[PDB]
RNA sequence: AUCGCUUCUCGGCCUUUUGGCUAAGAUCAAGUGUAGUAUCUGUUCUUUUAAUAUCGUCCUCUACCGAGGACAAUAUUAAGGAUUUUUGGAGCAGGGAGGCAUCGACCUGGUAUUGCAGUACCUCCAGGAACGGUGC
RNA sequence: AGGGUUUCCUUGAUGAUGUCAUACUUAUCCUGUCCCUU
């Protein structure tokens, strides 16, 4: 019916999960027929996804900017915050 | 609420003018000068932003009826 | 009683009103089905292929101009699953242990080559690897 | 013979409200036409 369910997370910033096991975190602003996927200000992450671990947070972060993946890699998305106004 | 309606200008200051008599009170983000293009003049009022309401309470205080332009000026919100 | 204002009834004006004629001018009747118009109710835009039609150059004719032919893609419509998008070619498969196999530079000595090139690598002889990668 | 102060912004202009369906009355459409009980 609605074809919504890609469309409602455009624009928002997103957690996309690979097939390896690596996390992309960027701004979802476009995807397709594949699922490949358009990724601004976008960082990749290894060895977690922070729920406020005490020690620190973030480790093995990596800036990459703007993404491009390609949809048979990508398992999952979840909704990571809101969009940047800009 | 950021932006002011300033009248009763004194006719022969621009937007320098403006920035130099009220940079005195605190930082400026905005000078707007509505213009008749047919003269290419000013009407005779404009409106001068601060970046601080505190900067901006501070001048109304100080320059309404003030000197050189000599004269009893009117501020409020512009809209 | 008289003068003025206001209810209420009534009389007179009310042709101010029926603006011709002929054979009372003549005659005396309907149902169904479709198409068009109007009104009311409900819900949508902007910011590849098939069919049809027809500016540049060359040639010919006539007095730079005009006509005729040929050549170079363009426009419209649809995607009810058949190669460039929306009815899928993808899928599934990695831990085990705390020595073994294979390849590659490589490090020491010594030794050979003196030629005009676009490159898996590049002399050889002996010694050395508490070296590096991969698999179990 | 003599003198004085209050503007919401502020153009040279190639998409907007519709459309579709149903119901009620003709310069069209066809008529010269009928039922039902003892």
């Given amino acids: 019916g609605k074809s919504s369910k890609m469309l409602q997370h455009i624009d928002y910033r997103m957690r996309c999960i690979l097939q390896d096991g690596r996390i992309f975190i960027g701004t979802f602003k476009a995807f397709d027929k594949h699922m490949n996927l358009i990724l601004c200000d976008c ?3 290894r060895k977690i996804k922070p729920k406020n671990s005490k020690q620190a947070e973030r480790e093995e972060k990596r800036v990459l900017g703007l993404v491009l993946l390609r949809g048979e890699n990508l398992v999952s998305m979840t909704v990571e915050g809101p969009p940047p106004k800009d | 609420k950021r932006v002011l309606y300033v009248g009763g200008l004194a006719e022969e200051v621009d937007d320098k003018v403006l920035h130099a008599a009220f940079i005195p009170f605190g930082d400026i983000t905005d000078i707007q000068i509505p213009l ?6 000013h009407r005779g009022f404009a409106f001068v932003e601060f970046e601080l309401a505190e900067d901006a309470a501070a001048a109304i205080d100080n320059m309404n009826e003030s000197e050189l332009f000599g004269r009893t000026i009117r501020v409020n919100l512009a809209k």
């Fill in chain 1, 43 to 45: 960082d990749e992450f």
């Fill in chain 2, 36 to 41: 008749d293009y047919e003269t290419e003049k």
